[PDB]
Amino acid sequence: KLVRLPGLIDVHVHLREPGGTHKEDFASGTAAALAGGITMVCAMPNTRPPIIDAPALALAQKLAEAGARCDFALFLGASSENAGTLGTVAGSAAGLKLYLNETFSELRLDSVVQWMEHFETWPSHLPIVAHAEQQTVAAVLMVAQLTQRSVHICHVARKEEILLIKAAKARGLPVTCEVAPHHLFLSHDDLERLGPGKGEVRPELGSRQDVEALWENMAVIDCFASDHAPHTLEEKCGSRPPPGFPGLETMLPLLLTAVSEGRLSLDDLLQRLHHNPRRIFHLPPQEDTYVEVDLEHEWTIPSHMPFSKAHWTPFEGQKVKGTVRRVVLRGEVAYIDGQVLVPPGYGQDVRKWPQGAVPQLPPS
Amino acid sequence: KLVRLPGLIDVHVHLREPGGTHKEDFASGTAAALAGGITMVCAMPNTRPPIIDAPALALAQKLAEAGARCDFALFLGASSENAGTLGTVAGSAAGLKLYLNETFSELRLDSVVQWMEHFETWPSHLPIVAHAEQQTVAAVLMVAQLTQRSVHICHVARKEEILLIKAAKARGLPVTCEVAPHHLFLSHDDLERLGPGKGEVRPELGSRQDVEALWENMAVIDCFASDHAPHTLEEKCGSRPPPGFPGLETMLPLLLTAVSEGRLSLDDLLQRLHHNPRRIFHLPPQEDTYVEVDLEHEWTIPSHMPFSKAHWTPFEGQKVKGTVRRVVLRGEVAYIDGQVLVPPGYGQDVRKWPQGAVPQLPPS
Ligand SMILES: NC(=O)N[C@@H](CC(=O)O)C(=O)O
Ligand SMILES: NC(=O)N[C@@H](CC(=O)O)C(=O)O
Ligand SMILES: [Zn+2]
Ligand SMILES: [Zn+2]
Ligand SMILES: [Zn+2]
Ligand SMILES: [Zn+2]
């Protein structure tokens, strides 16, 4: 007996195209998404070139329209030069991404004043998300309050961070957050097995106490999002390992295992992988779209999942219970039992759909 | 013709006793203060032992009462273990000091949650000051807002920081700040002369643009304070140079030079070295206390000033116009033309004066 889920949404993926296509491309990364029960992804802007201006966004849009197998929206990235220049294209993006800690030069912001300038100039009705670790969470929350708007905190990984966000929510501040599966299912304890190269990720893996705190504070977590960050094994095991884990193909099986164990409910999962992503990012429904999962099937995560070009996974050896059996995307069978059945280019930019535009008040 | 000033107050000094008396002690550091026209100092808690508990404060109080030549108040320091334990002694301190960036282990706070705990537990009517650089200024401001109270930012050194504070003040937030003379009168340009050991200080020396921004934003600066941070030349020039500059003996001559040049007014100076320190820290008046200065005398700062045991200065070679000629403290001549004339122990703890207690509402 299969369970029917709505089309799940991952608001934080790195698909590497343009410029990093040996790591992943739109076609491979969206195959990975479909195999993970994900029918819509929001792609981060730290590509080569980075998506920090209109011409780069135009290029990325065409590459995505040609290569994506599931639907998508593309983030713009904040830079030290582009505040006040993105107004004409802002509404066509998923949102604006700020990289506020070490950054996998072009996206480096060297001053909180630059953060303020982005918060002041980016249209008020459109999303802003931040890579903001530890005290940086408090700092960006202060900027959001000074500019009287909301912010979404990416990949929360620490007890410190989730408790700060909890305190902010208790004061009625408009902040939301997401947590990635590696910060719920891996910890420092796993670094011996992973080794120092594979284990590199930002935010870094937390202590057992960090992991426990995220679970205890599930009510504070608005979304799950993979931070799918593919790099090849050669890169991860080489002399300067880049940070990041692939995660699209493993996220849902890990979380379904947790549901089966009673660690959270099926509804808790669907709020965090469907309803809250929709409402925070103003993402439209996908007609005739659903995912069928098998909750009884037990399996062990192998050394690499079938689709991501990363060709490795930090979850290797973990036992899971839960499998994606079939995905239907806009009336077509997109995935069945390991076979992707929609071609590159089937996916569409949801921000171009009438229902995918973010509502705003009219010029004065 | 001499100009009579009120007794000036330095709210940020390191007097090194207990435990670092080769660098400075209460007797030498307060001689330095008097020679700099300063009649009251607030001493930071990063001594050995650090002033982080009642027994350490009791020791420091007696050492100060026995050694100080000018009046004083002693800060308590926040630690990872002492939130909620300082209530009985809090009112006897200058305030609570938080070290939020690298810290010249016992005072290290590893989580913003620990900052919140201090803001929640320290009595609401008493001062909190923070060493908070760059984004840490925004972060501690967020904690202050979440806990609905004020904060004072120590040694503001950067354009980024003063503009963030300016924005916070424009939003009516209760934040005040101080600036040290090295951040107004030295910059990166001076590092070639100083060398990498002598030049070490936290916050580090800023760019010319940082210095210019502090002057342009003088209206945002509530206090001047030396951050007198004495270390011997051997230490500064050795294999692991500690950060910090001595500054009590040079602060007023540098600032009087600026007054003479029309860079700020005499009143601007007295707001920042007298009235605003009094009002932010609730420090009492000193009866029969004043400073006589000569604004015409030109001199060049030598390789060391007479009193600080640091026995070096980063301002060596700078030409100044302005000299402290006489200081009277509570009716006694304390300093004349290079001679200190009050003994160790003349100084008193102002928090023990009836007028030096901070007013508060009565237990419910
Ligand atoms: N998280 C990572 O470790 N790496 C991400 C960057 C990011 O999400 O910050 C990547 O793009 O490789
Ligand atoms: N500022 C410094 O460079 N050093 C100070 C510490 C401080 O004020 O942060 C010291 O005590 O030596
Ligand atoms: Zn990130
Ligand atoms: Zn990311
Ligand atoms: Zn400091
Ligand atoms: Zn200091």
Curated annotation (Swiss-Prot), chains A, B:
Residues that, per the record, bind Zn(2+) 2: H12, C154, E178
Binding site for Zn(2+) 3: K97, H131, H155
Outcome when changing H131N: No catalytic activity
Chain spans, region DHOase (dihydroorotase): 1-329
Localization in the cell: Cytoplasm; Nucleus
Known outcome of mutating T103A: Abolishes dihydroorotase activity
Positions contributing to Zn(2+) 1 binding: H12, H14, K97, D227
Binding site for (S)-dihydroorotate: R16, N46, R202, H231, P243
Active site: D227
Quaternary data: Homohexamer. Interacts with CIPC.
Disease: Developmental and epileptic encephalopathy 50: A form of epileptic encephalopathy, a heterogeneous group of severe early-onset epilepsies characterized by refractory seizures, neurodevelopmental impairment, and poor prognosis. Development is normal prior to seizure onset, after which cognitive and motor delays become apparent. DEE50 is an autosomal recessive, progressive disease with onset in infancy and favorable response to treatment with oral uridine.
The protein's role, per its UniProt record: Multifunctional protein that encodes the first 3 enzymatic activities of the de novo pyrimidine pathway: carbamoylphosphate synthetase (CPSase; EC 6.3.5.5), aspartate transcarbamylase (ATCase; EC 2.1.3.2) and dihydroorotase (DHOase; EC 3.5.2.3). The CPSase-function is accomplished in 2 steps, by a glutamine-dependent amidotransferase activity (GATase) that binds and cleaves glutamine to produce ammonia, followed by an ammonium-dependent carbamoyl phosphate synthetase, which reacts with the ammonia, hydrogencarbonate and ATP to form carbamoyl phosphate.
Any further remark recorded for this protein: GATase (glutamine amidotransferase) and CPSase (carbamoyl phosphate synthase) form together the glutamine-dependent CPSase (GD-CPSase) (EC 6.3.5.5).
The protein's name: Multifunctional protein CAD
Native organism: Homo sapiens (Human)
Gene: CAD
Parent-protein start and end of this portion: 1460 to 1823 of 2225
